[PDB]
């Protein structure tokens, strides 16, 4: 069967994406996990595949699994987000540090990632119309007229998610050991840049759209103030990212 | 902005849906519509009047949800809302009295405590109209405290009193958590209390810091330092208990003290 071929191949992708190698999850295999969700309009074999891995024995393998999960939530078929809701309990179980076991010290990073991913899934449950990177043009195309009162509440939820990303990236930067490169730690910043920029772009477009063309727009000033605060804070994050040679080799850091 | 009569009619629908008997958080877009109304018309009078022809007191969940909605409108509405709220103190008080007791679902004590807190909040804003409803930080308030330390002392004391009200109320809300049910309606009241407590905390911290440099009288401010420390440790515990609530953390960032 070519069906059994497809299942066998995804199993290899998940395995190799979460190997013991202390670096970024192998891109071709993470890419193949993402593609699988689009090809079959289903992520069920992805979640099943991760559950049968020997990933809890090494905290690097657990951390690489969470990076892979994050990327698949971001870029996979929309159903991936829906099917992730049933796996909240399993995702929460990864926040342990049984084996690893703090020789390289990923425990705090694993707990912070699990907290973030559950917060991401909480948002997508509340706001199912979004895709994994909060695309504005995809979001606003689904209806003719959009409620600015829903828009206000949605932005404050996104800003709260932006705060979790900023806390998490700062924790990753603190864990950088001086000599000998931190490629696995730095690789987690790749989807965090994508997440934070996705949020930034949407809030920019939506907050602009909500402003009445003339008048003071007094009601939106709390969002403007928090938007500006998060902008300058995101500039600092992206400046620190642009000075990492390994991170800039993987992605283009947004300007802002 | 629409026709006045038609605008009040649409606001009535928002108030109705926000205060429905569904044991949930007040439906957020309708609470937002109530807040936005005050900015659009530069007046909260329609909101207060709209609440008067919305039956809520027969159902404890509706009454508690109404008090959450009132709290959010006081926080985020046009500044005139706080002034116009003063004439509705008697009515807010009436929501608790005509006593029920516990109630079937146990919102009775939470209702009475929310009314108690909201009256204390309005008492503060009457005495101290320089602040806004959400205690959005303004450095100017600490500058006033530098130049008028007698006034600053009294304002810090009153801020601390309001902080104690929030601490007592949040403790009561946590004690009424039930293992059956998502606790969303109860937890949706904690959200504005966390926001308000932090705003108060930032003001107390900055004003008390500013007053030590200006006056140089460590003996006179010692009671405020003693109370500050106590309230700090309480607030850490409050924010710690909130950190494990996933509905709350999805809506607001908990401060790290």
Residue numbers in the entry:
A (entry chain B): 7 to 262
B (entry chain A): 6 to 262
Can you provide the manuscript's text about this entry?
Clathrin-mediated endocytosis is essential for protein retrieval during neurotransmission and receptor recycling. Complex formation has been observed between the ENTH domain of epsin and the ANTH domain of Sla2, the yeast homolog of human huntingtin interacting protein 1 related (Hip1R). Epsin and the phospholipid PIP2 are essential for clathrin-mediated endocytosis, and we show how assemblies are formed between the ENTH domain of epsin and the ANTH domain of Sla2 in fungi.
The overall ANTH fold consists of helices α1–α11 and is conserved between CALM and Sla2/Hip1R subfamilies. A loop connecting helices α8 and α9 has a five-residue extension in Sla2, although with non-conserved sequence. Based on the low-resolution electron microscopy tomogram of the Ent1 ENTH/ANTH Sla2 complex from S. cerevisiae, these insertions point at the epsin interface. Especially the insertion of an α helix around Tyr 252 provides surface complementarity in the ENTH/ANTHSla2-binding interface, compared to the structures of the ANTH domains of AP180/CALM proteins. In addition, residue Arg 37 can toggle its side chain between the canonical PIP2-binding site of ANTH domains, and the ENTH/ANTHSla2 interface.
